[PDB]
Design an enzyme around this catalytic site. Structure first.
Site, PDB file in Angstrom:
ATOM      1  N   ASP A  37       3.600  15.323  -7.931  1.00 14.34           N
ATOM      2  CA  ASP A  37       2.909  15.662  -9.163  1.00 14.34           C
ATOM      3  C   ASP A  37       3.593  16.866  -9.827  1.00 14.34           C
ATOM      4  OD1 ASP A  37       1.122  13.614  -8.503  1.00 14.34           O
ATOM      5  OD2 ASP A  37      -0.472  15.077  -7.994  1.00 14.34           O
ATOM      6  N   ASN A  94       0.825  -1.195   0.000  1.00 12.99           N
ATOM      7  CA  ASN A  94       0.000   0.000   0.000  1.00 12.99           C
ATOM      8  C   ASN A  94       0.861   1.248   0.000  1.00 12.99           C
ATOM      9  OD1 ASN A  94      -2.449   1.687   0.760  1.00 12.99           O
ATOM     10  ND2 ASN A  94      -0.970   2.036   2.421  1.00 12.99           N
ATOM     11  N   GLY A 141     -10.327   4.701  -7.031  1.00 16.62           N
ATOM     12  CA  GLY A 141     -10.525   6.077  -7.445  1.00 16.62           C
ATOM     13  C   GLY A 141     -10.394   7.025  -6.271  1.00 16.62           C
ATOM     14  N   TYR A 142     -11.184   8.118  -6.296  1.00 13.66           N
ATOM     15  CA  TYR A 142     -11.112   9.134  -5.270  1.00 13.66           C
ATOM     16  C   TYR A 142     -11.674   8.631  -3.953  1.00 13.66           C
ATOM     17  CZ  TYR A 142      -9.988  12.733  -8.718  1.00 13.66           C
ATOM     18  OH  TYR A 142      -9.442  13.510  -9.696  1.00 13.66           O
ATOM     19  N   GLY A 187       3.139   4.296  -0.885  1.00 10.84           N
ATOM     20  CA  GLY A 187       3.332   5.049  -2.080  1.00 10.84           C
ATOM     21  C   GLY A 187       3.131   6.519  -1.837  1.00 10.84           C
ATOM     22  N   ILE A 188       3.742   7.331  -2.713  1.00  9.19           N
ATOM     23  CA  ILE A 188       3.700   8.790  -2.559  1.00  9.19           C
ATOM     24  C   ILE A 188       3.370   9.418  -3.924  1.00  9.19           C
ATOM     25  CG2 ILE A 188       5.440   8.813  -0.749  1.00  9.19           C
ATOM     26  CD1 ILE A 188       7.509   9.700  -2.739  1.00  9.19           C
ATOM     27  N   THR A 189       3.078  10.701  -3.914  1.00  9.38           N
ATOM     28  CA  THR A 189       2.968  11.474  -5.155  1.00  9.38           C
ATOM     29  C   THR A 189       3.970  12.620  -5.123  1.00  9.38           C
ATOM     30  OG1 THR A 189       1.300  13.029  -4.417  1.00  9.38           O
ATOM     31  CG2 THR A 189       0.462  10.997  -5.334  1.00  9.38           C
ATOM     32  N   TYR A 198       3.871   9.001 -11.415  1.00  7.15           N
ATOM     33  CA  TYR A 198       2.967   8.158 -10.629  1.00  7.15           C
ATOM     34  C   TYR A 198       2.294   7.074 -11.481  1.00  7.15           C
ATOM     35  CZ  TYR A 198      -0.700   7.264  -7.123  1.00  7.15           C
ATOM     36  OH  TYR A 198      -1.597   6.698  -6.297  1.00  7.15           O
TER      37      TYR A 198
END
Ligand SMILES: [Cl-]
Ligand SMILES: [Cl-]
Lengths: 245, 245, 245, 245
Positions: C92, C86, C182-183, C88-90, C151
């Protein structure tokens, strides 16, 4: 050298495909519904720009009509090397308002058509060891669309057909592929009020423009080419980035 | 008119792609690893068959090496219109036998390469309002493959890159697409003992034959063409029917 | 009976997963970054709610860090039957503005992590003839997203890994699957101004609401169950209809 | 609370589903073809095992037959909250040998059925703000199969339907999903000679065994649950790793 049949080949996307295949050097035969009175005006318009076509009437929803039509074409023009199953209608209605009549019209015209047109051409392509069959679907087959339980069922079904047939006859030199266009500049899409195009349709397309029918025709011509023999069972998206997966 | 860069463009699939793009009328530049001593023999062989190329050394796994190489190409040849990210290796090992060294070699060469080569070319294509970027993946990216946790991670990652970039720059006239070939007749595949080809590899391919590198090159040339501007964010399978979805 | 490791298990989606698996009867171990100083706070809260967990510091980007963490978990708790990747990072940024540092941070944390964490637990699962590995991806791996070439590459890469590993060990009773949310109503998303939620986020979701982390955790629990043994190599979408294919 | 309809519910996969949903606390209604004379036998068996079901004759290929069956179910049992479209048949023949009768039988039974059965239950689900529709497809819809241009077309079509309907009613708390099973240990498959199971079937499945109908039923139960409300428009593969994408 190759003889190509394009269903619904005298209008919209159909026509772009027929023109492009002609210009690639194929002998092109189109089909049209018996209700369409314009086949003589169309063949003259096409002769005027210097393209020689043949045109046959058929009801793609009716099995025997298709067997007959293909027999006539083979008699009059010669064996079918290439088939583009392009005929198709919409009867958009949410499931709550959709009746059996309009469910059926779409399934029979858009999916039964694939069986009815493809079955009578395959044995020859297999026997000669070369064929190209291109099934024209839609981005709404991949994505789904509101009001299109019938249309997306038919168009997604078309790609199930593509895959199974592709497996049956790949070894004999026949490819079977699906092409799924997004929004195109054709009469149905171009009649939408300008504000809806600008604020509803175009924002769904990363490219920021409608597709041209000639663009989709170029892709169909690539799939029908001699050097596309290792592409089979595929579904190629040509949609401006509207849908990716 | 257009200038194309093909990474790993001097051998196997790379070479077929470079030749085809040249014959389509593009000015082609290839890249090769510093360890490869054959760039002079290759450019002479190519000149002998009458094709003019340029060739630059780069380490696609190293960001600065790529920025430098692309600067030199723009200085010496001119702005990059087309990029085919074809460089890539395998280090096949089941996960149980796979060590970090060989995980890394594949991720850095095969996926970091996409960032390293693509970043320095995009601003120009966007500024001129035209570009084509083609990422060469593999059927094993789609399907998975035993011994390829590293390779399928890198190749599937490449298509994630394709999709996101495609969304960033579609509106500026730049397309980004992935091509996923199956088994090809290249030196690695053709060295397999004949009995393994016949009883293990070919039975996985409905077409019943290996793909030619020239076939995949023809598809890349279609994607780099002027009339393929409405295809973006796609992953096109060219695999003889080995995998369908 | 089963011992489960959930990377990133103390916050957000990871929390919901850790809670759900605990409540399903599993013994749950979580990991956190060594610079996260919240472990005692999270354990205290969980204890007051009646759940007992073990929490271990790890850098999932570092292969030896993960190998040593798992060895410690096996000594202090027992063999790992269930792993949920699970963490994980962003970072952007559009490709034009994305620097190597931020490409790398996301590839190493999000993709190399699957290799780093999964490799030290597979042999055990295989030797005992039972295991469940669940890789948490994202809708943005399927569809791509602006600002997420890094990502999407990592998250699409994860599913490449899923497929290849599933093929390697399916015969031994170990499953490997990807879940693509999703969101979700995590602290981060629920802190988006209500205004941006209503005009920018929710219109992307046919369900008309954010997903709950609990709902995604129920799916993970399903995949980790004894009766999900025939689901392997899949990528299950849980996105309110945001993306379909 | 919930009332569930499972078409084809008295045999094979449909049975396992009907059993599982019953045991989850739902009130289960099954349908069978009017020419099936096994209903009393199946009810008797189920009653002796402690489960109470209602069973109704229906022709799922016939729109009015389905509309009248649902009206009867609503009068005698109550409003339908859960529908599982499990009914379907095969009529396997290569396209070269497939006749219109056998194309039609499969399109009408397998695809028209989704429209026929789903249309009369949607309004209720929407009015009450809760519903679950599960369409049972096949791995052969995803991958195609020799002899199944009809079956793959129908089963791929079903997922087209799933997506479009999901988009129409997601905002009202109704989910629509497809489940695609691989090879299952039903009476039909377990009666394949052991020899053909070992050399032809099992090698296609990385798990090395047939799926159990119970396992597929556990997935359907998951999708029909209160906590699966954010999964919509999906196609979940449960095939032992036979196909991945
Ligand atoms: Cl952390
Ligand atoms: Cl029956």
């Amino acid at each position: 050298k190759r003889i190509a049949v394009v269903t619904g080949g005298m209008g919209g996307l159909g026509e772009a495909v027929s023109i492009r295949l002609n210009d690639a050097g194929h002998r092109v035969v189109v089909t049209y519904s018996p209700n369409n009175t314009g086949a003589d005006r169309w063949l003259t318009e096409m002769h005027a720009a210097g393209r020689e076509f043949h045109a046959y009437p058929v009801d793609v929803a009716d099995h025997d009509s298709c067997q007959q039509c293909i027999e006539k074409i083979v008699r009059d023009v010669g064996p079918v090397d290439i088939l583009v199953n392009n005929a198709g209608i919409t009867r958009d209605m949410t499931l709550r308002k959709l009746d059996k009549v309009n469910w059926d019209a779409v399934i029979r015209t858009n999916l039964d058509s694939v069986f009815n047109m493809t079955k009578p051409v395959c044995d020859g392509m297999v026997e000669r060891g070369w064929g190209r069959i291109v099934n024209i679907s839609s981005v709404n087959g991949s994505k789904g669309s509101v009001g299109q339980t019938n249309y997306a069922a038919a168009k997604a079904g078309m790609h199930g057909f593509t895959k199974s047939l592709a497996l049956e006859i790949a070894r004999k030199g026949v490819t079977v592929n699906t092409v799924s266009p997004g929004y195109l500049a054709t009469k149905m899409v171009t009649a939408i009020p300008q504000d809806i195009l600008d604020t509803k349709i175009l924002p769904q397309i990363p490219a920021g423009r409608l597709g041209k029918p000639e663009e989709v025709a170029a892709l169909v011509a690539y799939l029908c080419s001699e050097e596309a023999g290792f592409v089979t069972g595929s579904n190629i998206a040509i949609n401006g980035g509207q849908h990716m997966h």
